[PDB]
Design a protein around this ligand. Sequence first.
Ligand code: ATP
Ligand code: ATP
Ligand code: ADP
Ligand code: MG
Ligand code: MG
Lengths: 394, 384, 233, 889
Amino acid sequence: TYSRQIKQVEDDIQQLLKKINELTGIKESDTGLAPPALWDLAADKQTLQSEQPLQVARCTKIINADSEDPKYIINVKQFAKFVVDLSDQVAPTDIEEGMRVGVDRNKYQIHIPLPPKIDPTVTMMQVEEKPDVTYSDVGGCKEQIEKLREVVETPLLHPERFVNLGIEPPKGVLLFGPPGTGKTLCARAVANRTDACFIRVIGSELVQKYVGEGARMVRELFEMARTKKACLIFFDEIDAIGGARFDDGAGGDNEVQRTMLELINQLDGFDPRGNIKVLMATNRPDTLDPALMRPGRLDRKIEFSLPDLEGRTHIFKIHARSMSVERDIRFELLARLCPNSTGAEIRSVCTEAGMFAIRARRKIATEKDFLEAVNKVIKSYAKFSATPRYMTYN
Amino acid sequence: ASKLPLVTPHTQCRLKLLKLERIKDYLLMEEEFIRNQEQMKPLEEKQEEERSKVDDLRGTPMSVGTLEEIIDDNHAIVSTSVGSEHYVSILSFVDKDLLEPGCSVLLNHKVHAVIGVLMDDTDPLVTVMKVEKAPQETYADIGGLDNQIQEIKESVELPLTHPEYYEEMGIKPPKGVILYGPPGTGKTLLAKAVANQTSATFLRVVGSELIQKYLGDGPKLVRELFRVAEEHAPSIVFIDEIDAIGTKRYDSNSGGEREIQRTMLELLNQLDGFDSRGDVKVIMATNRIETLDPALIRPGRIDRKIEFPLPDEKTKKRIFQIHTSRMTLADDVTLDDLIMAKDDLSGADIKAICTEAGLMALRERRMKVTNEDFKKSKENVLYK
Amino acid sequence: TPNCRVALRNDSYTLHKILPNKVDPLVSLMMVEKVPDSTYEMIGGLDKQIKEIKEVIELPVKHPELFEALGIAQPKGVLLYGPPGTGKTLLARAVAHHTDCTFIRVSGSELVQKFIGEGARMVRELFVMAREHAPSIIFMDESEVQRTMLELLNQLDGFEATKNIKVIMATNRIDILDSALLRPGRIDRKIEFPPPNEEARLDILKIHSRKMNLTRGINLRKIAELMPGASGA
Amino acid sequence: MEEGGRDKAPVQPQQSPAAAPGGTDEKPSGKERRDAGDKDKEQELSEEDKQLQDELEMLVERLGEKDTSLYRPALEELRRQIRSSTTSMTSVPKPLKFLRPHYGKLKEIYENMAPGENKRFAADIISVLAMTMSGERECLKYRLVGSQEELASWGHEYVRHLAGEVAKEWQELDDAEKVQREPLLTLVKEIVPYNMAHNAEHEACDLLMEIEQVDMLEKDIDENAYAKVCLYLTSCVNYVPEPENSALLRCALGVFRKFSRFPEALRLALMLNDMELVEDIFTSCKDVVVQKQMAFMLGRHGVFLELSEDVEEYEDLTEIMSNVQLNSNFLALARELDIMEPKVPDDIYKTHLENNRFGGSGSQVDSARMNLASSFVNGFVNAAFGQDKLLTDDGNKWLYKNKDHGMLSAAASLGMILLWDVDGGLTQIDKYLYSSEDYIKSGALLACGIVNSGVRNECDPALALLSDYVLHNSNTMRLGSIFGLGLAYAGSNREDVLTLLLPVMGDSKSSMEVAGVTALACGMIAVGSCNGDVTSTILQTIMEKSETELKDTYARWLPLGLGLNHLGKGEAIEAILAALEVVSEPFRSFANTLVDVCAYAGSGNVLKVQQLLHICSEHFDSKEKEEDKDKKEKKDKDKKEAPADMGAHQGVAVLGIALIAMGEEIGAEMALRTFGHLLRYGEPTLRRAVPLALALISVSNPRLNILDTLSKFSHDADPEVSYNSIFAMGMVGSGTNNARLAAMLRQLAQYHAKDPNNLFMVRLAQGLTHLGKGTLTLCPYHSDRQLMSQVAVAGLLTVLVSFLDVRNIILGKSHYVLYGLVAAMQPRMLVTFDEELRPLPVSVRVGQAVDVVGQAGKPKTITGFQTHTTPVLLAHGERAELATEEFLP
Ligand SMILES: Nc1ncnc2c1ncn2[C@@H]1O[C@H](COP(=O)(O)OP(=O)(O)OP(=O)(O)O)[C@@H](O)[C@H]1O
Ligand SMILES: Nc1ncnc2c1ncn2[C@@H]1O[C@H](COP(=O)(O)OP(=O)(O)OP(=O)(O)O)[C@@H](O)[C@H]1O
Ligand SMILES: Nc1ncnc2c1ncn2[C@@H]1O[C@H](COP(=O)(O)OP(=O)(O)O)[C@@H](O)[C@H]1O
Ligand SMILES: [Mg+2]
Ligand SMILES: [Mg+2]
């Protein structure tokens, strides 16, 4: 009824919000500047306080000390080397050799030790954040879930039942099967439930242009692994990181083999890694080198096969619990119609048959809509099917 | 800016009056609230006194730095342009959230302390493969197919335009879409139609140019590619001719097939990574569908498989009707004789015969196209 | 302006003055390559091929509307073929020289590389300089050339809106290139270059015999018969 | 340009109305038959809403407007039929014949005469006939008439029936979504006196439709979520009889007339309590309506069900009182022990593990104030039947060591361990009560008042805490004996023990740590009447607060219980009653805003808010009334939790620009508690904006303001992924932000969200706009956190057990008589529907479907399937009886 009276009372304050917030100051879309009233701690004090008593303290690297005297041999990025001194702010204890320290620009003396260098693309692959996959969603392979879980988390969540028995639990485990079987999806639940550093590694991220370049990434990776108390290291598609050694004539594929041998040395012998747990995942496990296949690195060897009948029905109950359906259908008929099938294929059946409900104008799918999914996904897409040479893994 | 997203009465109501009247009171309260500050305390003006004081802090030479670590009490190790890195402190007008490892900042000239960050410039790779505008005409240009058009709108367009149908259903859209058939059947043409249709960001890359001459630059290019595709919005990633990564070998590749393989491994990760993917759609096309790795083809990574047949003759006459629409056609010609000239001709062949016939018209400067233009036009196009 | 040299003071780095412009990287590129610039006046007896290439390239610049008079799309791809030494480079240089287009060949070299970019992970980064010299023509010699041309034609099949950008490939023995390149919806016109006959050797003797200090009475017809038609070189 | 040819309507309506002054006089047939030809042709050629560009309605008034102005007024012999041919033609195009000053001259065509039965030519047409014109009547015409001319002539008397029949035309044409225009006609009509138009459309709404009750019923309470004092006073008591007179849905009475309880009349919800006790059907809906009367939004009802039919249905009152409270116990007796909860989870202190090797060594923090937080390893994790047998040794060996308020604290944690209990909570205290200690007996008997929270059976009317009170000549025997009785009997309205606690205020004892929380204890009991409590407060306030100029022991404790005793009404009398009561010097006029705005918790009266921040904006205040302006912002912390997303964005968008951004003391010291009184849940728009001012501690201020916002920021329940944002701040909190004043504070912050794996619904929003108190149990701690002198000595009474109105968690409850059903539910997001197509799409979060007692969450709306039909209460209320019916084969 009051067409202008609602409209101008709307509009004058929808503009006047800007007309007073300009008077406050949120404007001048920056080039890298703060909100104008957040830096007010450094309005006056830290302008002449974080700058005028403070200095650059350029960071360096220790070569070695000497006896009887400090006389520290220092090193910098490009420039020369010096024989430097402490400050009074430090004891000479934690000024150990091969260490980064912060050093003033004029006297060239040492202020504070630093954490060492970490290569940045190794820092990127720390996960920092967790997915949402719950162990309810990996239904069908419960014995594999338990046999994995007893290695992964039980010494971490309970480091007393193994100690008071007097056993060292296994530290290595690989996971393998056909594609789409639930390996990576099974790992996402591990990343869900876990609490420590879950450092993921995909093997194709380690192929580098320079010679031996990836091996140093492996080294620094296990360095920051050894910095933490407990840590989980995830490996995916390790056929790229190594098959075997087969060189002949023109020696090819060597650069992968050097990084793989470095991974071997970082896994076993000569300062063992301690509380670091690894986890591999491949598609075809036959190509792998047997020294990598040696236990002590790859203890648990979990098979992933297709579910028998009941695991398949359970997968139907997982992917099919959350969609508007006819109530009185049965899934066991569908699991009879899918002898050899993965949970990905079953998910494509459910998510396809919902689209069969969206075909004409229905809101709840039917059993014959499921039948229209089965012949298409199984039998019409049955030309490709992706499975059988991966059943023999060749 | 983001002040009241509640617009749901959508009428002349006392609610929509009072929403503003309340916010009218709050914001007049903020006006006369701050009005005492510039009348009572003009010591700091806060429009140019504090900002000019920041500009008095920062020097006029503003050196550009590089981030590699963060220590939280506003000092960090930052890299110089030469490489001789420092351990400077960070100021407080520095908006402590954009700072990531590898980011570029602004340093002091004197003590090299972190003045601010810099919103870094783009385009090394983004505007190479980002599609600028709508390429061509609409789905009415296609004709004759009419079924897989519903399939592609089904998997791609409808989840965008109607995000209610899947939520009333309890379902997510199918992930992967692949195209295959004989060459010249309109695989790229349908992608032009979708690129006309959509509103999301659209990315296109040939499957040939995935390969590199340096080792690992392939999979690195893959990782930064899906980085770029993820970081913007709900986009559409198009890949044409992905057989060519498997068919041809090039001597610029210092690696053999066991580097192409590793590129396909990293790509195989980037379709179905354990990471949260996001609103990214994948559309693929080839003609040798039998050659490539089926682990890429499995449901879960590619859901919908779409065959393109050769056109039937009633679709062929429709395609003749399309490509002979806006041309001055003399009545000498009969399209039906032109239909059965080749038993398995394509729309590209039809368009080639039409355009080459127009070239035969322009050789003789004419405007209409005669029959013998088509008679020698099929001789030029077809047989050699 | 972006990408311009300036003068700069040193104490406070205040911007002093704008200096002269940087040389264009395309100009430095062609200065590196040094194609033999040519004209119609040094063509020996190829006039029907001239009439073909005028129809292909000369028309969709000076008369783009003339294709809208017929309702057909404009051609984009040219394949020249014939034995080497038969005028391919001078012809393709000459056409752009007369229609005033930026003759930009590509070789896949790496001295050229620093002017395209630091790596130029595609060929497609060339298109910035191409549409920056928008009435331009791309030239190619004789498998990386063959994939590169496919990467060009997949862009300018409708994915690039800027016109007046055309590509030209020259080779011999047309049957040994790609069948996907031999898809009939791809190549717009293919032009054969034959070896010269006794007529078409005499005029190359005429044009080429211009800069020499001759003697009166030469009878180039006899010498043109003495050469049994190898090529123009 | 296709003109001419078909010009019949720009020619014959151009000629015959032009020949009408030449055919009015001396042509009596041409006056009327051409006017009838101008009535049926403009009528029938103007009914269709497809050709809205009519051929006369924007065509004839090039000459027919001056012809109308020289036709109706300038004729002066307008008879009884030619007004029906004249004013039925000249009234149809007149909102578009005239320009925008039509509003004062709709009457110069219509009020000459309304022609006959005006809806006869407004039958087919929707809103271009007169509904827009009637909007021009009720917009300006009935505003100028009904400003001070309500009881009047034709400008009201016919306007009631005209605005009645138009409103029947809205629910007569289509039954579209134009039904909600009837609140926009009945409400725009006589804005303040809404009752007289609600008389004109309430019985028409009774005869309107039964299906068209719910969306306009939601539209009316949508218009009643926030309103002016008289329109919320009027449209809500008009909103009450709609599912009582017209509809028989009748189970949404008590939870939605708690809306209509306080500002209208305190006896109105008692007459609606009678309306509960009259519809005596069976027991399902009768049961479920009276379920909420004990521990879901109110108390003070347990003397009203002792009628003459005490067998089982009027013996429901004992079951309401303690047996469904015992079902709230049964949530943790069965339904929490079955899912996850062991007797000692205990491992968040074990989650504090990794700082020994994260950068150096450990075994360094050995402060005795760490043990104050280490008693909450016992205290916080053990709520909801987390009972402990010799697992209270962290409170046992610290109970006999030092820290007298820690001897109160470890003895007071047992009440937080045994919550909602009457069965053995008095027996678990006595094993550690007998210690002969002023602090152990007072904290333990203080916990006795905590265990019986919500019971109000025979535990302590004058039994235990009165015996704790009568020992007094000293410390917390005097103090902690009045706290638990106002705590447990805070939901009670009993006057007798209020007059046992009235000589505590009337003592005028110098123990001001007792006399201050006396107002906080008696304020929690009463919210309405008994002005003698307010007299007892103001008399000691004049005897003690006047002859001094000292600390906020007075200011934080004494007027706050007066705001409790005058909470919740919009009438603006109580501000006159208490603001003119202690008219005084400004340190005693600290209580200006207390009773003023404590009456105004959730409403819309933002004119109060401009007279709440225009008086003292900054004034530069050289240490003068920074506490009064911090309290002036403390009373900005209402109005924002429930205007249904109206002021929350306008508090994060105004206070983050105003006070913590551009202030000196209010923002730097205090103005973050709006995010601790506004919310308890959490969204990242401020959840990732407060650690910009927290993780930057900026110790240049009195840094225990920022450390006060550490644990307070952590005030948010419903536990989250915030262990990074808190454990990082305790990781830098190991070295920095020292443990000498904060070792209780960082682990107090960490343990606060996830004490248990449930019990957090404390947000004063259980369902929708539900109040459910707390506004008495939650407020005095946020008023108590002034700045200091209470982190060590005095505030250890309130920092443990301040808020204890935790009405549990869940809504997934069967409550069958046998209790055999589990559920058939489907949890989703909060709804978005206001008006849409048919089955209004409710919400969009279909991806979750359970059938068990699982988690609730804040923005959740839950429905079902199976044709269970859920016919009990149908909206919200978390104790659905869950009957079923199968008239759907
Ligand atoms: N037990 C299961 N229950 C439900 N879904 C499953 C199960 N196993 C597999 N899936 C489905 O299969 C899909 C693929 O999972 P995942 O990525 O782990 O396959 P994979 O075994 O790692 O093989 P690939 O290495 O090819 O991915 C997942 O999206 C998941 O939904
Ligand atoms: N069904 C059709 N209707 C109309 N035009 C068509 C059709 N099929 C092909 N064309 C024409 O053929 C040309 C080539 O189309 P397109 O390149 O998309 O086919 P393609 O199968 O993608 O070929 P390639 O196998 O080389 O990728 C298009 O320009 C289009 O005009
Ligand atoms: N028709 C011709 N007229 C004159 N000179 C020619 C002709 N054909 C080739 N040449 C000579 O051949 C050389 C260029 O070879 P060309 O055929 O253009 O490139 P390519 O041999 O790489 O295809 C020039 O030096 C030119 O003098
Ligand atoms: Mg996988
Ligand atoms: Mg194609």
